PDB file of C-alpha atoms and ligand atoms in Angstrom:
ATOM      1  CA  UNK A   1      -5.533 -18.035  44.509  1.00  0.00           C
ATOM      2  CA  UNK A   2      -3.084 -20.058  46.716  1.00  0.00           C
ATOM      3  CA  UNK A   3      -0.682 -22.987  45.910  1.00  0.00           C
ATOM      4  CA  UNK A   4       0.654 -24.628  49.126  1.00  0.00           C
ATOM      5  CA  UNK A   5       3.923 -26.621  48.912  1.00  0.00           C
ATOM      6  CA  UNK A   6       4.952 -28.562  52.076  1.00  0.00           C
ATOM      7  CA  UNK A   7       8.286 -30.483  52.139  1.00  0.00           C
ATOM      8  CA  UNK A   8       9.241 -33.186  54.743  1.00  0.00           C
ATOM      9  CA  UNK A   9      12.765 -34.808  54.718  1.00  0.00           C
ATOM     10  CA  UNK A  10      11.744 -37.874  56.916  1.00  0.00           C
ATOM     11  CA  UNK A  11      14.651 -40.237  56.128  1.00  0.00           C
ATOM     12  CA  UNK A  12      16.059 -41.131  52.672  1.00  0.00           C
ATOM     13  CA  UNK A  13      12.794 -39.503  51.385  1.00  0.00           C
ATOM     14  CA  UNK A  14      11.801 -35.964  50.337  1.00  0.00           C
ATOM     15  CA  UNK A  15       7.950 -35.901  50.538  1.00  0.00           C
ATOM     16  CA  UNK A  16       6.344 -32.816  48.879  1.00  0.00           C
ATOM     17  CA  UNK A  17       2.591 -32.159  49.463  1.00  0.00           C
ATOM     18  CA  UNK A  18       1.042 -29.757  46.878  1.00  0.00           C
ATOM     19  CA  UNK A  19      -2.401 -28.115  47.478  1.00  0.00           C
ATOM     20  CA  UNK A  20      -4.077 -25.973  44.744  1.00  0.00           C
ATOM     21  CA  UNK A  21      -6.621 -23.701  46.612  1.00  0.00           C
ATOM     22  CA  UNK A  22      -7.241 -21.720  43.346  1.00  0.00           C
ATOM     23  CA  UNK A  23      -9.733 -21.977  40.388  1.00  0.00           C
ATOM     24  CA  UNK A  24      -7.214 -22.971  37.658  1.00  0.00           C
ATOM     25  CA  UNK A  25      -5.257 -26.262  37.297  1.00  0.00           C
ATOM     26  CA  UNK A  26      -1.482 -25.807  38.042  1.00  0.00           C
ATOM     27  CA  UNK A  27       1.347 -28.035  36.706  1.00  0.00           C
ATOM     28  CA  UNK A  28       4.176 -28.542  39.277  1.00  0.00           C
ATOM     29  CA  UNK A  29       7.748 -29.625  38.407  1.00  0.00           C
ATOM     30  CA  UNK A  30      10.251 -30.734  41.081  1.00  0.00           C
ATOM     31  CA  UNK A  31      13.990 -31.438  40.329  1.00  0.00           C
ATOM     32  CA  UNK A  32      16.405 -33.076  42.908  1.00  0.00           C
ATOM     33  CA  UNK A  33      19.666 -34.124  41.248  1.00  0.00           C
ATOM     34  CA  UNK A  34      18.945 -36.413  38.274  1.00  0.00           C
ATOM     35  CA  UNK A  35      15.173 -36.965  39.041  1.00  0.00           C
ATOM     36  CA  UNK A  36      12.425 -34.553  37.812  1.00  0.00           C
ATOM     37  CA  UNK A  37       8.761 -35.255  38.870  1.00  0.00           C
ATOM     38  CA  UNK A  38       5.751 -33.498  37.264  1.00  0.00           C
ATOM     39  CA  UNK A  39       2.100 -33.492  38.348  1.00  0.00           C
ATOM     40  CA  UNK A  40      -1.150 -31.649  37.535  1.00  0.00           C
ATOM     41  CA  UNK A  41      -2.921 -30.441  40.777  1.00  0.00           C
ATOM     42  CA  UNK A  42      -6.610 -29.654  39.896  1.00  0.00           C
ATOM     43  CA  UNK A  43      -8.509 -26.977  41.917  1.00  0.00           C
ATOM     44  CA  UNK A  44      -9.185 -28.275  45.485  1.00  0.00           C
ATOM     45  CA  UNK A  45      -6.925 -31.329  44.881  1.00  0.00           C
ATOM     46  CA  UNK A  46      -3.861 -32.295  47.063  1.00  0.00           C
ATOM     47  CA  UNK A  47      -1.032 -34.404  45.484  1.00  0.00           C
ATOM     48  CA  UNK A  48       1.895 -36.077  47.322  1.00  0.00           C
ATOM     49  CA  UNK A  49       5.259 -36.343  45.419  1.00  0.00           C
ATOM     50  CA  UNK A  50       8.047 -38.525  46.928  1.00  0.00           C
ATOM     51  CA  UNK A  51      11.718 -38.758  45.895  1.00  0.00           C
ATOM     52  CA  UNK A  52      14.119 -41.465  47.296  1.00  0.00           C
ATOM     53  CA  UNK A  53      17.922 -41.269  47.603  1.00  0.00           C
ATOM     54  CA  UNK A  54      20.253 -43.684  49.531  1.00  0.00           C
ATOM     55  CA  UNK A  55      22.442 -40.536  50.144  1.00  0.00           C
ATOM     56  CA  UNK A  56      19.929 -37.899  51.484  1.00  0.00           C
ATOM     57  CA  UNK A  57      22.657 -35.258  50.674  1.00  0.00           C
ATOM     58  CA  UNK A  58      21.469 -35.475  46.977  1.00  0.00           C
ATOM     59  CA  UNK A  59      18.403 -33.445  48.227  1.00  0.00           C
ATOM     60  CA  UNK A  60      20.609 -30.313  48.758  1.00  0.00           C
ATOM     61  CA  UNK A  61      19.203 -28.041  45.975  1.00  0.00           C
ATOM     62  CA  UNK A  62      15.562 -28.979  45.154  1.00  0.00           C
ATOM     63  CA  UNK A  63      13.790 -26.782  42.506  1.00  0.00           C
ATOM     64  CA  UNK A  64       9.948 -26.265  42.361  1.00  0.00           C
ATOM     65  CA  UNK A  65       8.212 -24.743  39.286  1.00  0.00           C
ATOM     66  CA  UNK A  66       4.428 -23.961  39.423  1.00  0.00           C
ATOM     67  CA  UNK A  67       2.949 -23.382  35.860  1.00  0.00           C
ATOM     68  CA  UNK A  68      -0.604 -21.913  35.210  1.00  0.00           C
ATOM     69  CA  UNK A  69      -1.943 -22.558  31.637  1.00  0.00           C
ATOM     70  CA  UNK A  70       1.761 -18.709  30.370  1.00  0.00           C
ATOM     71  CA  UNK A  71       2.644 -18.093  34.064  1.00  0.00           C
ATOM     72  CA  UNK A  72       5.505 -19.808  36.002  1.00  0.00           C
ATOM     73  CA  UNK A  73       6.877 -19.252  39.529  1.00  0.00           C
ATOM     74  CA  UNK A  74      10.262 -20.952  40.162  1.00  0.00           C
ATOM     75  CA  UNK A  75      11.426 -21.705  43.768  1.00  0.00           C
ATOM     76  CA  UNK A  76      15.037 -23.054  44.386  1.00  0.00           C
ATOM     77  CA  UNK A  77      16.022 -24.177  47.925  1.00  0.00           C
ATOM     78  CA  UNK A  78      19.819 -24.412  48.617  1.00  0.00           C
ATOM     79  CA  UNK A  79      20.725 -26.156  51.959  1.00  0.00           C
ATOM     80  CA  UNK A  80      24.343 -24.962  52.480  1.00  0.00           C
ATOM     81  CA  UNK A  81      25.911 -25.245  55.984  1.00  0.00           C
ATOM     82  CA  UNK A  82      23.754 -23.838  58.850  1.00  0.00           C
ATOM     83  CA  UNK A  83      21.729 -21.732  56.295  1.00  0.00           C
ATOM     84  CA  UNK A  84      18.676 -22.440  54.009  1.00  0.00           C
ATOM     85  CA  UNK A  85      18.565 -20.047  50.964  1.00  0.00           C
ATOM     86  CA  UNK A  86      15.137 -19.794  49.166  1.00  0.00           C
ATOM     87  CA  UNK A  87      15.339 -18.150  45.653  1.00  0.00           C
ATOM     88  CA  UNK A  88      11.893 -17.152  44.157  1.00  0.00           C
ATOM     89  CA  UNK A  89      11.609 -16.067  40.475  1.00  0.00           C
ATOM     90  CA  UNK A  90       8.212 -14.729  39.202  1.00  0.00           C
ATOM     91  CA  UNK A  91       7.800 -15.215  35.360  1.00  0.00           C
ATOM     92  CA  UNK A  92       4.041 -14.367  35.186  1.00  0.00           C
ATOM     93  CA  UNK A  93       2.256 -11.025  34.361  1.00  0.00           C
ATOM     94  CA  UNK A  94       1.179 -10.476  38.037  1.00  0.00           C
ATOM     95  CA  UNK A  95       2.799 -10.006  41.496  1.00  0.00           C
ATOM     96  CA  UNK A  96       2.713 -12.959  44.001  1.00  0.00           C
ATOM     97  CA  UNK A  97       2.988 -12.976  47.839  1.00  0.00           C
ATOM     98  CA  UNK A  98       5.186 -15.954  48.917  1.00  0.00           C
ATOM     99  CA  UNK A  99       4.636 -16.969  52.585  1.00  0.00           C
ATOM    100  CA  UNK A 100       7.575 -19.103  53.899  1.00  0.00           C
ATOM    101  CA  UNK A 101       7.505 -21.217  57.161  1.00  0.00           C
ATOM    102  CA  UNK A 102      10.682 -22.930  58.555  1.00  0.00           C
ATOM    103  CA  UNK A 103      10.221 -24.095  62.173  1.00  0.00           C
ATOM    104  CA  UNK A 104       9.466 -20.890  64.223  1.00  0.00           C
ATOM    105  CA  UNK A 105      10.505 -18.404  61.389  1.00  0.00           C
ATOM    106  CA  UNK A 106       7.581 -17.100  59.195  1.00  0.00           C
ATOM    107  CA  UNK A 107       8.431 -14.707  56.313  1.00  0.00           C
ATOM    108  CA  UNK A 108       6.367 -12.983  53.551  1.00  0.00           C
ATOM    109  CA  UNK A 109       7.875 -11.408  50.363  1.00  0.00           C
ATOM    110  CA  UNK A 110       6.169  -9.878  47.321  1.00  0.00           C
ATOM    111  CA  UNK A 111       7.787 -10.940  44.000  1.00  0.00           C
ATOM    112  CA  UNK A 112       6.893  -8.703  40.999  1.00  0.00           C
ATOM    113  CA  UNK A 113       7.065 -10.088  37.423  1.00  0.00           C
ATOM    114  CA  UNK A 114      10.764 -10.527  36.390  1.00  0.00           C
ATOM    115  CA  UNK A 115      12.040 -10.087  40.010  1.00  0.00           C
ATOM    116  CA  UNK A 116      14.180 -12.795  41.737  1.00  0.00           C
ATOM    117  CA  UNK A 117      14.099 -12.732  45.594  1.00  0.00           C
ATOM    118  CA  UNK A 118      16.568 -14.674  47.845  1.00  0.00           C
ATOM    119  CA  UNK A 119      15.663 -15.089  51.578  1.00  0.00           C
ATOM    120  CA  UNK A 120      18.318 -16.681  53.869  1.00  0.00           C
ATOM    121  CA  UNK A 121      17.250 -18.565  57.062  1.00  0.00           C
ATOM    122  CA  UNK A 122      19.680 -19.419  59.938  1.00  0.00           C
ATOM    123  CA  UNK A 123      19.720 -22.640  62.054  1.00  0.00           C
ATOM    124  CA  UNK A 124      21.327 -23.284  65.434  1.00  0.00           C
ATOM    125  CA  UNK A 125      19.868 -26.764  64.617  1.00  0.00           C
ATOM    126  CA  UNK A 126      19.724 -28.118  60.965  1.00  0.00           C
ATOM    127  CA  UNK A 127      16.573 -30.185  62.001  1.00  0.00           C
ATOM    128  CA  UNK A 128      14.735 -26.748  61.883  1.00  0.00           C
ATOM    129  CA  UNK A 129      14.896 -27.092  58.030  1.00  0.00           C
ATOM    130  CA  UNK A 130      13.254 -30.581  57.980  1.00  0.00           C
ATOM    131  CA  UNK A 131       9.610 -29.455  57.244  1.00  0.00           C
ATOM    132  CA  UNK A 132       9.919 -26.152  55.264  1.00  0.00           C
ATOM    133  CA  UNK A 133       6.714 -24.978  53.523  1.00  0.00           C
ATOM    134  CA  UNK A 134       5.772 -22.150  51.107  1.00  0.00           C
ATOM    135  CA  UNK A 135       2.543 -20.723  49.701  1.00  0.00           C
ATOM    136  CA  UNK A 136       2.324 -18.639  46.482  1.00  0.00           C
ATOM    137  CA  UNK A 137      -0.720 -16.199  46.600  1.00  0.00           C
ATOM    138  CA  UNK A 138      -2.088 -14.241  43.511  1.00  0.00           C
ATOM    139  CA  UNK A 139      -5.771 -13.186  42.765  1.00  0.00           C
TER     140      UNK A 139
HETATM  141 TB1   TB B 201       5.225 -36.756  57.608  1.00  0.00          TB
HETATM  142 TB1   TB B 202       3.241 -30.348  30.870  1.00  0.00          TB
HETATM  143 TB1   TB B 203       2.655 -24.132  30.689  1.00  0.00          TB
END
């Protein structure tokens, strides 16, 4: 299994592309401020989710929840100063590799059931954090 989540912050828009390269349908929840969007991604399927905000600063702390039907992986991104914090919580019965890609930086962490992992990324240039992407891998 693999669920690919790509984010682009092109403008007043957060685009999220979700690919389910696994054999079970996943439900994906995204929260940014007052707006929550929710989508089923069937096996093989790609879905685009787009938030708008006049003030693009309201996209500071987006949360992603992948549900398999229990089984949830929660991913919170906190853009604070020159740093991007990524907090991964695994609430399933099985470990998950999370591969993270922010500009040049590539980073892989295992997350066992009931573990929370925080990875911090640095930027010389806050435009490094404009197209962050993460993949959750299971079995
Ligand atoms: Tb684009
Ligand atoms: Tb539902
Ligand atoms: Tb469920």
